[PDB]
Write a protein that binds this ligand. Structure first.
Ligand SMILES: COC1CC2(C1)CN(c1cc(Cl)c(C(=O)N3COc4c(cccc4-c4cc(N5[C@@H]6CC[C@H]5COC6)c(C(=O)O)cc4F)C3)c(Cl)c1)C2
Length: 285
């Protein structure tokens, strides 16, 4: 059995919540809080351990971008600090290849990173890899066919519909087919050999649209839109289905959790988070 973990987020200030949802019975476990509250972080899992990467602590006493990497063990209910990244990265994207964590883009104040770095849990060390062709904050990250994809975001001037791919053996990036829609702060994941980009902001409107990248045809196709338009949503895959958690729609910090079934091409509202929040990091283990 596996759970959907949600770490951090934002509602009035950055949050430290760590909760786990069980899609089988609809329950939520309240787990050990993060040591530092963070929103705009990303989550990932390597060897059954959950990692909270980057983000920012927006508090009444100040706003600080995070270069932190923290590791949570579900067996011990404890968070442990790991080696920090070279730079703080708020609104970061993360992907895992062969048990190695890639921290992609994100911001540190007014700096919009195009830099990318890779963490080895086996050595507790980070190292920079080739930088992206585009600076991207609010970027979605997908791992497919041992390639790392960086989708959408904001380059410091424009919100982006562009996407690019990293080749680990060659240590290089190339631009791929751009999405139909500009999406900054979308939820990006991989399901059944396809990349999905759900929601996000196009520069004018919060989106409920969802599009899917097919590798063989190099095309983005729209699938069923979500019930609730949202940006800065958590996203993950559990048992062949996509789950989107929270986010912000221009008026509300959503507690909605929707689930996409690819066989029927339908979204259904399956539960609510214990409190409405945006900018969470999510992972399954
Ligand atoms: C009472 O007024 C207050 C309430 C207020 C203003 C504090 N409000 C807040 C405060 C916060 Cl700390 C957040 C939040 O969770 N963040 C900050 O943005 C992001 C987070 C994570 C991923 C992407 C974005 C992002 C979010 C963006 N924004 C888009 C889509 C969401 C966000 C705002 O709407 C436009 C953009 C962008 O502008 O392109 C780029 C991104 F990387 C984390 C949100 Cl979502 C709203 C909203």
């Amino acid at each position: 059995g596996r759970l959907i973990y949600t770490a951090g987020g934002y509602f009035r200030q950055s949050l430290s919540y760590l909760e786990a949802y069980n899609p089988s019975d609809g329950t939520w476990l309240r787990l050990a809080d993060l040591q530092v509250p963070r929103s705009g972080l990303a989550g990932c899992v390597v060897g059954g351990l959950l990692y909270a990467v980057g983000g920012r602590n927006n508090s009444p006493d100040g706003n600080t971008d995070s270069s932190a990497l923290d590791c949570y063990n579900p067996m011990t209910n404890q968070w442990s600090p790991c080696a920090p990244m070279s730079v703080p990265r708020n609104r970061i994207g993360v992907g895992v290849i062969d048990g190695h964590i890639y921290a992609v883009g994100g911001s540190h104040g007014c700096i919009h990173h195009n830099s990318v770095e890779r963490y080895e849990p086996e050595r507790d060390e980070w190292h920079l890899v080739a930088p992206m062709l585009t600076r991207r904050i609010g970027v979605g990250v997908a791992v497919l066919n041992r390639l790392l994809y960086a989708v959408g975001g904001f380059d410091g001037t424009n919100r982006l519909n562009s996407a690019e791919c990293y080749y680990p053996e060659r240590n290089e990036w190339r631009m791929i087919t751009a999405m139909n829609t500009i999406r900054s702060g979308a939820g990006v994941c991989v399901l059944h050999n396809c990349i999905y980009a759900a929601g996000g902001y196009d520069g004018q409107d919060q989106l409920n649209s969802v599009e899917r990248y097919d590798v063989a045809t190099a095309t983005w196709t729209f699938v069923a839109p979500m019930k609730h338009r949202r940006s800065a949503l958590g996203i993950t895959v559990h048992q062949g289905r996509i789950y989107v958690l929270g986010g912000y729609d221009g008026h509300t910090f959503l507690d909605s959790v929707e689930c996409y079934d690819p066989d029927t091409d339908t979204w259904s509202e399956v539960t609510r988070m214990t409190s409405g929040r945006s900018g969470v990091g999510v992972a399954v283990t």
